[PDB]
Design an enzyme around this catalytic site. Structure first.
Site, PDB file in Angstrom:
ATOM      1  N   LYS A  21       0.802  -1.213   0.000  1.00 24.22           N
ATOM      2  CA  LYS A  21       0.000   0.000   0.000  1.00 24.22           C
ATOM      3  C   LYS A  21       0.854   1.292   0.000  1.00 24.22           C
ATOM      4  CE  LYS A  21      -4.233  -1.883   1.935  1.00 24.22           C
ATOM      5  NZ  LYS A  21      -5.074  -1.668   3.140  1.00 24.22           N
ATOM      6  N   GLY A  24       2.488   2.063  -3.219  1.00 21.98           N
ATOM      7  CA  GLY A  24       1.551   2.503  -4.237  1.00 21.98           C
ATOM      8  C   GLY A  24       1.226   3.987  -4.147  1.00 21.98           C
ATOM      9  N   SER A  50      13.550  -9.839  20.544  1.00 21.35           N
ATOM     10  CA  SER A  50      13.363  -8.412  20.884  1.00 21.35           C
ATOM     11  C   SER A  50      12.037  -8.116  21.592  1.00 21.35           C
ATOM     12  CB  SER A  50      13.477  -7.528  19.635  1.00 21.35           C
ATOM     13  OG  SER A  50      14.461  -8.006  18.738  1.00 21.35           O
ATOM     14  N   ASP A  61       5.053  -1.655  18.155  1.00 23.24           N
ATOM     15  CA  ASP A  61       5.902  -1.779  16.962  1.00 23.24           C
ATOM     16  C   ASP A  61       6.223  -3.205  16.521  1.00 23.24           C
ATOM     17  OD1 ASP A  61       7.656  -1.743  19.382  1.00 23.24           O
ATOM     18  OD2 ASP A  61       9.316  -1.801  17.934  1.00 23.24           O
ATOM     19  N   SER A 103      20.475   9.144  21.342  1.00 24.91           N
ATOM     20  CA  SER A 103      21.462   8.417  20.505  1.00 24.91           C
ATOM     21  C   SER A 103      21.802   9.196  19.240  1.00 24.91           C
ATOM     22  CB  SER A 103      20.915   7.039  20.110  1.00 24.91           C
ATOM     23  OG  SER A 103      19.729   7.163  19.311  1.00 24.91           O
ATOM     24  N   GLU A 128       3.447   0.340  13.739  1.00 24.66           N
ATOM     25  CA  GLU A 128       4.174   1.602  13.832  1.00 24.66           C
ATOM     26  C   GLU A 128       4.773   1.933  12.485  1.00 24.66           C
ATOM     27  OE1 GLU A 128       8.090   2.136  16.194  1.00 24.66           O
ATOM     28  OE2 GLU A 128       6.647   3.243  17.428  1.00 24.66           O
ATOM     29  N   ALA A 140      20.422   5.421  10.948  1.00 25.49           N
ATOM     30  CA  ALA A 140      19.688   4.419  11.740  1.00 25.49           C
ATOM     31  C   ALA A 140      19.989   2.986  11.284  1.00 25.49           C
ATOM     32  CB  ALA A 140      18.187   4.698  11.718  1.00 25.49           C
ATOM     33  N   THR A 141      20.132   2.771   9.977  1.00 23.34           N
ATOM     34  CA  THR A 141      20.432   1.417   9.457  1.00 23.34           C
ATOM     35  C   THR A 141      21.761   0.941   9.989  1.00 23.34           C
ATOM     36  OG1 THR A 141      19.065   1.763   7.494  1.00 23.34           O
ATOM     37  CG2 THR A 141      20.760   0.020   7.335  1.00 23.34           C
TER      38      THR A 141
END
Ligand SMILES: [Cl-]
Lengths: 189, 203
Positions: A21, A24, A50, A61, A103, A128, A140-141
């Site tokens: 979605k 798109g 986790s 999340d 962080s 989330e 972040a990755t």
């Protein structure tokens, strides 16, 4: 296990549907020849491990989606689109872009109820949706992989990661400014 | 294929895309629960513009009422193993909160004079669009493979002959319609045995 497989089915289905979605939205902007606020989308179900620690649903999340945009100003364009959507109800928004985490992490979080149709009936879960820039996603990755590969960083490493996040953000700001200064250098003179 | 045709059809292209994935996810859900899926194959299409224009001329539909009167601009085809699986799929559709079933047509119980067998479910389906939510009609047909084989072929011939089949072609249409029904009836006779065997192992 099989028990965890069963509990997570609806979250796995929701991530799948929401990825398609949200992707798109982008195709709809391009087809109608306009800047897509959305560049690309990713998502995952929180790994069993986790989840387990972090509980005393309001675990927000388990289903997580990541929407990447080019500029900070695109973030609100995406939040508005989410408001206009009929397949979800926004439960919670957190602006960690205007107010970053300690962080260095920056992101705009939108928590939604989302309903999934199954052969056993409809199931409503929370998901989330994290909206962030390419620069914040770059940071972040990498931060996320170094973390997952470590364990808690020494203080010096934590500081250096904070510094790179600070600079990644100055970069977003500057790219925002270049974009503005281009359109301004046409709109007003 | 103009700009206004493109803006009109998009919700339907979007709806077909979503519905294909959702209908296939049913099949996938059964299999994930180690059950055999009534649904074997799922197909879909947006009606081509010149078929839309034809149907408008032949039904008396104008541009203003097009989205209200033409039921199958978005068309889905669900292929099932058994005639008696049709109702099982229809049950799963009634259970869904992402659509509203507005009409059903049973051309299995009420087989057409030509030999045509199929089951039509017309639904209201809402797509989310950067210009806002948009509600469309979609037609989901449910068929056995033998029903699908005969129908898709009859439809093709009928595009050419529009009701006026050469004697030879009609004779063949009628015998194949009988043979195809008979295939589904004969197999239906041992459906319980087949399904009991299928519950034992799904590859
Ligand atoms: Cl398929």
């Amino acid at each position: 296990t099989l028990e965890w497989e069963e509990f997570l089915d609806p979250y796995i289905q929701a991530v799948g549907e929401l990825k398609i979605k949200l992707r798109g939205i982008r195709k709809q902007y391009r087809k109608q020849n306009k800047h897509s606020p959305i560049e690309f989308v990713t998502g995952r179900v929180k790994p069993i491990e986790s989840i387990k620690e972090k509980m005393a649903h309001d675990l927000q999340d388990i289903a997580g989606l990541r929407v990447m945009v080019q500029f900070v100003d695109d973030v609100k364009e995406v939040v508005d689109i989410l408001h206009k959507r009929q397949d979800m109800r926004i439960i919670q928004e957190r602006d960690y872009i205007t107010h970053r985490k300690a962080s260095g992490y920056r992101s705009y979080h939108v928590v939604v109820e989302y309903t999934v149709d199954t052969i056993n009936g409809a199931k409503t879960i929370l998901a989330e949706i994290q909206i962030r820039t390419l620069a914040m996603n770059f940071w972040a990755t990498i931060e996320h992989s170094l973390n997952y590969k470590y364990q808690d960083f020494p203080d010096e490493i934590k500081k250096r990661l904070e510094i790179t996040a600070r600079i990644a953000h100055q970069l977003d700001e500057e790219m925002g400014e270049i974009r503005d200064d281009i359109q301004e250098a046409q709109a007003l003179f």
